[PDB]
């Protein structure tokens, strides 16, 4: 089946998404991404926002524990950083402080008693204060034995505006790279040219990282892939790259419906 | 000041975005289309989702009403049609029913025993089931006195894919036309003649309701218009149409924090 992950916690409730733990029982994922914690530039505690799911997120241990238990992992992505014009001292080393304590110790923190494995960061603008790589190397540097995987999803244009610098620090386990919405990299029909030389470009620039290729599973998304297509394609083309990961599903609630990866090859 | 409406509910939480009487409160906006209600083409009861601002929604009651008190109108966007591939029937006119039912008629509902002011439409696919040119159709057949107003929120492409049929019907009051993420019709910087020409095709094609002319109120989505551009080079333009309306602002977060809506001419 090889590698595919998915984004999960931004469908709406579970009656719409489905749960965290349908989405590990389904068998189709080896990774999820829990979307999204919000972060504060002025150090404030993050916020969890799973939108209609919960928001007393504590019983969610019980299903992270669940999906590890069948070797999947998951990743919490930090989606949104409030910035503030105050120049505030330790809001970067603080925030990984929080993060090490609340997810990655196995404590009572927003997702419960948990080890996480690992933090993505979506492609949004750090703070004044917050900034990204210095959260990356700070978290990989953490007091612990413990591995945390670091990702993050930048668009794919190269470089990454927002992303950049963290990708540099060389530091990454994973990119996430999204090739939906409308961006000069997508597939459109029948022209994959665009989104071949975006995968050259970040599998030859990034070579210490993992690269996912991050696909809508609706046809209602630009950028949609046809499985056939991805299949006979694109796939056939892009695994030539030694670190091509495999495919990022964007995302659990179109991908419940749509059943994209079932469709993927073997 | 003119007419300044914004989406909330999206935006995180109370921290992040502001609670919904603060949005009120500010006295930018007098009008706020409340994001998201899940609705299920099969028939399950919606589910409101307002991200990490609560999951128990009953107690913005008293936030709505002061809001209307200030003479400002509320209105809740239907965002997500969970899809369904089983035939069922009156699928829409019971949506139509709990909709008045729960946000029409001064009862105990998801957002506590309030009547809102109307119904907005995500550009999103409607349902097997569910129709939204037969929902809107529905609604202002409602059995009730009070006045709903409804509206749409279609990309700035004309016709828009997923809403044509619901404009059709005439019985849009408004129309909240996007022109923020990447699309053919949105400003790019020194060059409105796109939108200057999709602004001329919502407004001569649907002149039976009030344009809004929905941007982004920070410079990181493509479509951004700086302030003195859309004051002195946008508005004289397009405010030429007798049907537009004013500016729609994506989105309270945003504005919460750049203040763009401030910004704005009198
Ligand atoms: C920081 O990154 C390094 C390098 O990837 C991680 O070090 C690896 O840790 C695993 C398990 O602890 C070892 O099996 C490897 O031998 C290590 N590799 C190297 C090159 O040293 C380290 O674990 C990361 N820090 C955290 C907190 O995950
Ligand atoms: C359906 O649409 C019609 C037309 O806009 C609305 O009828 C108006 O209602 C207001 C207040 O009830 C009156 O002042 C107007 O004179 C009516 N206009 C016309 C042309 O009849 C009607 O209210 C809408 N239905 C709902 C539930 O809002
Ligand atoms: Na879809
Ligand atoms: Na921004």
């Known amino acids: 089946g090889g590698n595919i992950v998915?984004?999960?916690?931004?469908?709406?409730?579970?009656?719409?998404?489905?749960?965290?733990?349908?989405?590990?029982?389904?068998?189709?994922?080896?990774?999820?991404?829990?979307?999204?914690?919000?972060?504060?530039?002025?150090?404030?505690?993050?916020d969890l926002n799973l939108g209609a799911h919960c928001v007393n997120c504590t019983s969610l241990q019980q299903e992270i524990k669940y999906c590890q238990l069948k070797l999947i992992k998951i990743l919490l992505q930090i989606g949104q950083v409030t910035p503030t014009k105050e120049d505030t001292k330790d809001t970067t080393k603080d925030l990984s402080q929080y993060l090490d304590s609340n997810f990655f110790s196995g404590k009572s923190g927003p997702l419960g008693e948990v080890y996480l494995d690992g933090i993505d960061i979506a492609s949004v603008p750090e703070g004044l204060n917050l900034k990204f790589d210095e959260l990356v190397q700070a978290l990989n540097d953490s007091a612990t034995s413990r591995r945390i995987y670091l990702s993050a999803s930048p668009n794919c244009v190269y470089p990454d505006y927002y992303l950049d610098k963290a990708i540099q620090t060389q530091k990454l386990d994973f990119l996430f790279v999204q090739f939906f919405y409308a961006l000069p990299c997508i597939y459109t029909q029948g022209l994959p040219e665009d989104l071949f030389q975006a995968?050259?470009?970040?599998?030859?620039?990034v070579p210490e990282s993992k690269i996912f290729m991050?696909?809508?599973?609706?046809?209602?998304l630009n950028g949609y892939i046809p499985?056939?297509?991805?299949?006979?394609?694109?796939?056939?083309?892009?695994?030539?790259?030694?670190?091509?990961?495999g495919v990022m599903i964007f995302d659990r609630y179109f991908d419940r419906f749509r059943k994209y990866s079932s469709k993927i090859k073997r």
């Open 6 to 46: 998915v984004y999960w916690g931004q469908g709406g409730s579970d009656n719409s998404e489905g749960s965290l733990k349908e989405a590990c029982k389904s068998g189709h994922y080896n990774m999820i991404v829990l979307e999204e914690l919000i972060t504060y530039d002025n150090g404030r505690d993050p």
């Open 199 to 205: 995968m050259k470009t970040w599998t030859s620039n």
């Open 214 to 220: 991050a696909l809508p599973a609706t046809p209602d």
């Open 227 to 245: 499985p056939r297509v991805l299949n006979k394609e694109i796939l056939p083309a892009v695994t030539q790259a030694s670190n091509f990961a």
